[PDB]
Amino acid sequence: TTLLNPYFGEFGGMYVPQILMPALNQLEEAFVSAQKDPEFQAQFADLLKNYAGRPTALTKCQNITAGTRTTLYLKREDLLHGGAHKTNQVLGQALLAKRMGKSEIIAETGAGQHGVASALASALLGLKCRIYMGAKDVERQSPNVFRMRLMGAEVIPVHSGSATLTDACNEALRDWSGSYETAHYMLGTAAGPHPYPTIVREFQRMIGEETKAQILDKEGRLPDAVIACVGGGSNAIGMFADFINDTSVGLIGVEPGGHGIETGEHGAPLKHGRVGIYFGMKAPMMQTADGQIEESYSISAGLDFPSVGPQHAYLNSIGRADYVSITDDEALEAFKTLCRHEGIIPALESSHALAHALKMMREQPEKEQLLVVNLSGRGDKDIFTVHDILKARGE
Amino acid sequence: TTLLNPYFGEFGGMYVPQILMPALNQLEEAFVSAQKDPEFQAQFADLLKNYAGRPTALTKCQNITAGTRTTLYLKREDLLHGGAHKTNQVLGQALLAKRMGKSEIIAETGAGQHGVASALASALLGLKCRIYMGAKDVERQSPNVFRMRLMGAEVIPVHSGSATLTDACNEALRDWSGSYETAHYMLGTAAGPHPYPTIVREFQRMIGEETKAQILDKEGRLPDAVIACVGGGSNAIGMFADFINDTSVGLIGVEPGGHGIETGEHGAPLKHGRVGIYFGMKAPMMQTADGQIEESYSISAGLDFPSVGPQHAYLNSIGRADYVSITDDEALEAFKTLCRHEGIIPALESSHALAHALKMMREQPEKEQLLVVNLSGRGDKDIFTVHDILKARGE
Amino acid sequence: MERYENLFAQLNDRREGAFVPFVTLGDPGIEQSLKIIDTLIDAGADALELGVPFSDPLADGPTIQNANLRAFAAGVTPAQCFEMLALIREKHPTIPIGLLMYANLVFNNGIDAFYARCEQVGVDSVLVADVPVEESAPFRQAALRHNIAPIFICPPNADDDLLRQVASYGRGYTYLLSRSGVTGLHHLIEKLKEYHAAPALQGFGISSPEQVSAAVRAGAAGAISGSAIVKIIEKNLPKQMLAELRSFVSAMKAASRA
Amino acid sequence: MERYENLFAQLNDRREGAFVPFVTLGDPGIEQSLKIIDTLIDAGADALELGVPFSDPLADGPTIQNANLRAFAAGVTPAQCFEMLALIREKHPTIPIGLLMYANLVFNNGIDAFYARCEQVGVDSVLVADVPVEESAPFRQAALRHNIAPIFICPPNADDDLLRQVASYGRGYTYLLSRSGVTGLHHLIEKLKEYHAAPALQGFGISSPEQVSAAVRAGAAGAISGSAIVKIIEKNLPKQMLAELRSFVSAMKAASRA
Ligand SMILES: O=P(O)(O)OCCNS(=O)(=O)c1ccc(OC(F)(F)F)cc1
Ligand SMILES: O=P(O)(O)OCCNS(=O)(=O)c1ccc(OC(F)(F)F)cc1
Ligand SMILES: C=C(/N=C/c1c(COP(=O)(O)O)cnc(C)c1O)C(=O)O
Ligand SMILES: C=C(/N=C/c1c(COP(=O)(O)O)cnc(C)c1O)C(=O)O
Ligand SMILES: c1ccc2[nH]cnc2c1
Ligand SMILES: c1ccc2[nH]cnc2c1
Ligand SMILES: c1ccc2[nH]cnc2c1
Ligand SMILES: c1ccc2[nH]cnc2c1
Ligand SMILES: [Cl-]
Numbered sequence A, B: 001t002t003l004l005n006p007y008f009g010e011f012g013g014m015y016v017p018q019i020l021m022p023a024l025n026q027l028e029e030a031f032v033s034a035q036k037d038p039e040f041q042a043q044f045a046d047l048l049k050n051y052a053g054r055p056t057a058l059t060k061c062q063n064i065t066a067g068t069r070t071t072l073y074l075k076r077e078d079l080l081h082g083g084a085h086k087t088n089q090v091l092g093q094a095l096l097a098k099r100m101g102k103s104e105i106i107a108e109t110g111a112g113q114h115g116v117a118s119a120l121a122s123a124l125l126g127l128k129c130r131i132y133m134g135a136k137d138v139e140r141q142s143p144n145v146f147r148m149r150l151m152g153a154e155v156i157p158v159h160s161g162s163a164t165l166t167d168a169c170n171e172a173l174r175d176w177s178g179s180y181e182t183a184h185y186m187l188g189t190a191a192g193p194h195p196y197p198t199i200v201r202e203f204q205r206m207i208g209e210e211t212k213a214q215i216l217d218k219e220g221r222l223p224d225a226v227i228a229c230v231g232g233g234s235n236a237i238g239m240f241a242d243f244i245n246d247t248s249v250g251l252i253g254v255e256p257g258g259h260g261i262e263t264g265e266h267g268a269p270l271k272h273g274r275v276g277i278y279f280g281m282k283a284p285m286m287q288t289a290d291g292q293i294e295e296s297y298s299i300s301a302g303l304d305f306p307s308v309g310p311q312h313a314y315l316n317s318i319g320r321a322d323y324v325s326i327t328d329d330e331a332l333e334a335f336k337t338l339c340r341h342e343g344i345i346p347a348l349e350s351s352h353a354l355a356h357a358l359k360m361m362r363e364q365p366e367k368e369q370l371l372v373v374n375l376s377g378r379g380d381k382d383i384f385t386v387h388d389i390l391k392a393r394g395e
Numbered sequence C, D: 001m002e003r004y005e006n007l008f009a010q011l012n013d014r015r016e017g018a019f020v021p022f023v024t025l026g027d028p029g030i031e032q033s034l035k036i037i038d039t040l041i042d043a044g045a046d047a048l049e050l051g052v053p054f055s056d057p058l059a060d061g062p063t064i065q066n067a068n069l070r071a072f073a074a075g076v077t078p079a080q081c082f083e084m085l086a087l088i089r090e091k092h093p094t095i096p097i098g099l100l101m102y103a104n105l106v107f108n109n110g111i112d113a114f115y116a117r118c119e120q121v122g123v124d125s126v127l128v129a130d131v132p133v134e135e136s137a138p139f140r141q142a143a144l145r146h147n148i149a150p151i152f153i154c155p156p157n158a159d160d161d162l163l164r165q166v167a168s169y170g171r172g173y174t175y176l177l178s179r180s181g182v183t184g185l186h187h188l189i190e191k192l193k194e195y196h197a198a199p200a201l202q203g204f205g206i207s208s209p210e211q212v213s214a215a216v217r218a219g220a221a222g223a224i225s226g227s228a229i230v231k232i233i234e235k236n237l238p239k240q241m242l243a244e245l246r247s248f249v250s251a252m253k254a255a256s257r258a
């Protein structure tokens, strides 16, 4: 039995070895108690404001929409301490760990924004942190690696399997299978077994709540649509959650198309995979005909994941939210466009969301539309990636 | 004649070739008019809030002061768009340029935070930007270089002279000597000829104004002292300005000691140089016995400058503000301390200010004191520098 | 599941305990794996626990992760595993055969279709490592409809609710988990019997003849041993391989007499 | 400053214009520089403009920046420049000698002490490139107290206030700036005479005999030429050097007759 519904329609659940069910039940109980605890909420609000820098700006893009009837705002999670929205929910989960009397943190990371977020929260709150990261990921964002260990975190490269994000995910559950008794597993997205999809949404929903207050202040109405990239689902559901019952607001999630959906080198299981059970959840997966989990692909390490959180699969199924894909080349163009015309260097992850907003404007330039892009992080971590690509081309 | 006093006691003035005096007089007139223009002030406030992210957080450090009677707050200019306080005043100066009907921007940079700030402001406001940077600086923060040209700025390495920041400064005045008619020179610190020390202070004073409002809200009183690093003087005078008439508030500026003042490899002209005329101002300079300008040295590129703004020389002379120095090794220790115990990676520039606050606490751990460090930027740009140092040692 | 019930009857009739080894199917190859499995039964294994290679073996530590990798290097697919199962059953009519599966392989082509194939090849039980009792309803229902025993894990610190559900939901045998973590306590045995649970086998870490007699004496119906066999496959990766596992199994099963 | 007044009297008495070259002192060396300076005067230079090497020559473009660098490579210091000045004056009693200084070299050891040294060695004028008329008071006062003419720049687009201040504050000659920018318009000459300004020389970009006769015809008292001489030093960096500059100077001064 559970205190909260573990499913979103047919998606979700707790598909973990029996040994881990007490840990999930404990976490669920702590979360429900914390959500009712004004002192917990006060502490969480204090860290978000005074340490992470909330509320984040809502920036109106003048230049990039010139000549069209699109008004485009960017929710500036790139300005959050750490450089991405990952920081919001690690602060809440780190408090949850302390509420449970736990003193160690386990985290998984591919791009490294979540591992850095895990390390900084653990440095601040006195938790001993260890981070699993696919060894192929440790090579290409050594910057983010060195950030975590500067912050006192133990960084553990992953040699099992493909040696990437999904492999990093399995190491974390493997370790937490060892002793959840002293460690809390700080899952970094709105996916995995219940209660993580619920917890991560609630600890990210300030993205959407602030966006709604700020758009109403600046425009006097709700947006026509909010657009966010989808790696596992946290920034998107964080943007979406507070608009779900405003039925006139479109909810648009953007999966990575990689080299092109038709190539199969992509990360878009929600629209191009099929339902499976992995990583403790029933959700869309990229998988072989006989049920092996496939390797995904995206230029942006933080979208490169062959599944997606179950609430997105459900919002898609009932038509509440729509999901699209953006290729590497399209994300790279939107990255360049934002640098050059707004002076903001976006994460390549967020550049997928930006790329789709620019497509909605460009395809129908006389359509009147008020759009918000969740700008989930800054792209300083990507300038080396972008430089090498630009160099292999001309320019 | 001038509209405003060009001197702070004996320091300051307009020591430029005659050809540039109309440009300085024009800028002074535009600034005085803008300061009285509520529409200019509204536009500037809008960019600061909605684009740069102001107000910045005031973060109380719990862990690093444990066991002492020091309360330490960090004014989080590291959370500003661009990653440093440089962004504040480029937005004001870019508006000033547009007020004058100018369409091009010239800037100088050594660390690159100011060049990146110049490029992003120019990208946003439709200005064509070109940046002079000592070619020795272009090699060691290639990250910041690529950030500027991603943003459409022309980056011009400097081969003249020592090929560093001071050389970059002379190229800018040399170019602006060419045609101020179409370009505005966006000087990046509270130094140079009048009116720049005055303009940069007023366009940075929100650092101190917010700090005062926030400390009063959180502690009900003014701080005992505000501490800031001093490269040319902008973040420090930006912190200081609003406290100058609160005579109980100590004002502490920190120059780089480099390898040690006694080595002469340092950047501390205010306390260890002597008055001279260079870069359009009369101010303390590091100089040879016969009046040649010396080369300075700091581990942190952004403090590595052999002069200082004239208002600091004046505040020092009358005893209102006190100036100290922090060595490379001390700044490196405070950098590590902040990473490990607060989960914040500070700029090595700001780590000098932090290092001196930690010294005030550690030297007198039972002295009751409420301190604010201007945390002028984040240290992502320094992790490569710090890694190479750490590797040459053990650890 | 009726093979398990005949085996346990003919073990306490013998006053004996069960020794059940685990290997990954097709490790290190298809033809070779069939020889290891034949040697295990000849050396005295009472039943088998057989792993189908999965891309993401989440409950398995490095020993059996590499077993899966070796099987994937051989091109081993689930379909070919079921051809191996048919051959094993056709040679060994009475040996209980349990499968260790991960949920996605069972769910992939339809839960009922998976258990129907298990029945067609002569599989006796299925343990799905990442399906707790809380999620087990469609899996155990499909299992029972196809005469497959659904195997459930009883963790060391297990509450009374969990003991009752495992006792009521399981068939064939109850998997007594010996520690936390991944592949690489007597107080619960009587309570399992009190609730008429399937006979208990302790496993998940057993690597030498010491533990077996300890489990049989605790009243557990036998023991399972995973990584120890795979490590022996691991140590000698072909002729000296087979003699190594033959020696290991007899020492284990000798210990189940007392 | 009285050398300038005797020179200008003896040039319009000649119905002639002045040609004043600039070199950096000690470029490319101390002993060599003294030979270039001697060749300049012998080749027909009416006066000299002499640069003291400075670490940060802010008003100077790459041609003369490198002149400063070459002098610094030779170890040339301000003190040794004043020993060179003493030797130049001792060989050439009537040639007006102007110094091109940067403010920090004048201010370094005391403004009055600097001009006192200028007078002691026989310098006639001092132009401080980074001191505008707005900042000039202590410099021009110290200059006049030591019989040194303070030279002021008259920029192309200069207002009437600036023309009056330059006319009243300057001595020796008025530097007519020919363009903006760094080293590398007749309407103002009459107004300078109207305010009794020191005679005007146009400079800052002159590189061929065309401009000189144009300036003399505009009623300007002569012309100054900077980078052109240094480039000629630059082109032939020793014997062929001296013949190159000798040829250049005579063409310039021939043009000042008409
Ligand atoms: O000897 P060891 O410790 O390697 O154990 C061998 C493992 N093989 S197995 O089929 O028993 C087995 C049993 C249960 C597993 O996970 C679960 F408990 F959650 F179900 C995984 C493998
Ligand atoms: O031939 P060019 O164009 O190189 O000119 C030679 C330069 N030598 S100089 O002493 O006349 C000279 C005169 C003025 C200068 O700056 C100032 F105008 F601000 F004062 C710099 C050099
Ligand atoms: C996968 C990681 N990052 C993901 C990420 C994502 C995708 O994760 P969510 O779908 O959970 O927002 C989006 N934006 C940024 C800046 C990100 O860093 C990681 O840091 O491990
Ligand atoms: C010199 C530069 N930076 C200076 C700097 C300084 C020193 O400049 P001021 O003294 O003007 O604050 C302090 N902090 C940070 C983060 C800085 O980047 C530059 O970016 O060119
Ligand atoms: C609340 C609690 C448990 C639940 N299980 C399914 N739906 C639920 C709602
Ligand atoms: C996808 C999958 C797992 C993740 N952990 C952190 N960010 C993620 C994105
Ligand atoms: C105002 C304006 C000009 C000034 N010059 C000196 N002090 C002043 C004050
Ligand atoms: C010192 C000197 C010049 C600068 N320009 C920008 N930052 C500076 C610091
Ligand atoms: Cl369900």
Ligand SMILES: [Cl-]
Pocket: A041, A044, A045
């Ligand atoms: Cl909150």
Ligand SMILES: [Cl-]
Pocket: A142, A143, A146, B383, B384, B387
């Ligand atoms: Cl690194």
Ligand SMILES: [Cl-]
Pocket: B007, B009, B010
């Ligand atoms: Cl004065």
Ligand SMILES: [Cl-]
Pocket: B041, B044, B045
């Ligand atoms: Cl303002």
Ligand SMILES: [Cl-]
Pocket: A383, A384, A387, B142, B143, B146
């Ligand atoms: Cl780079």
Ligand SMILES: [Cl-]
Pocket: C167, C168, C169, C170, C171, C196, C197, C198
């Ligand atoms: Cl039963």
Ligand SMILES: [Cl-]
Pocket: D167, D168, D169, D170, D171, D196, D197, D198
């Ligand atoms: Cl006169």
Ligand SMILES: [Cs+]
Pocket: A065, A066, A067, A068, A069, A070, A071
């Ligand atoms: Cs628009």
Ligand SMILES: [Cs+]
Pocket: A230, A231, A232, A255, A256, A267, A268, A269, A303, A304, A305, A306, A307, A308
């Ligand atoms: Cs994905």
Ligand SMILES: [Cs+]
Pocket: B065, B066, B067, B068, B069, B070, B071
């Ligand atoms: Cs304290």
Ligand SMILES: [Cs+]
Pocket: B230, B231, B232, B255, B256, B267, B268, B269, B303, B304, B305, B306, B307, B308
């Ligand atoms: Cs300095």
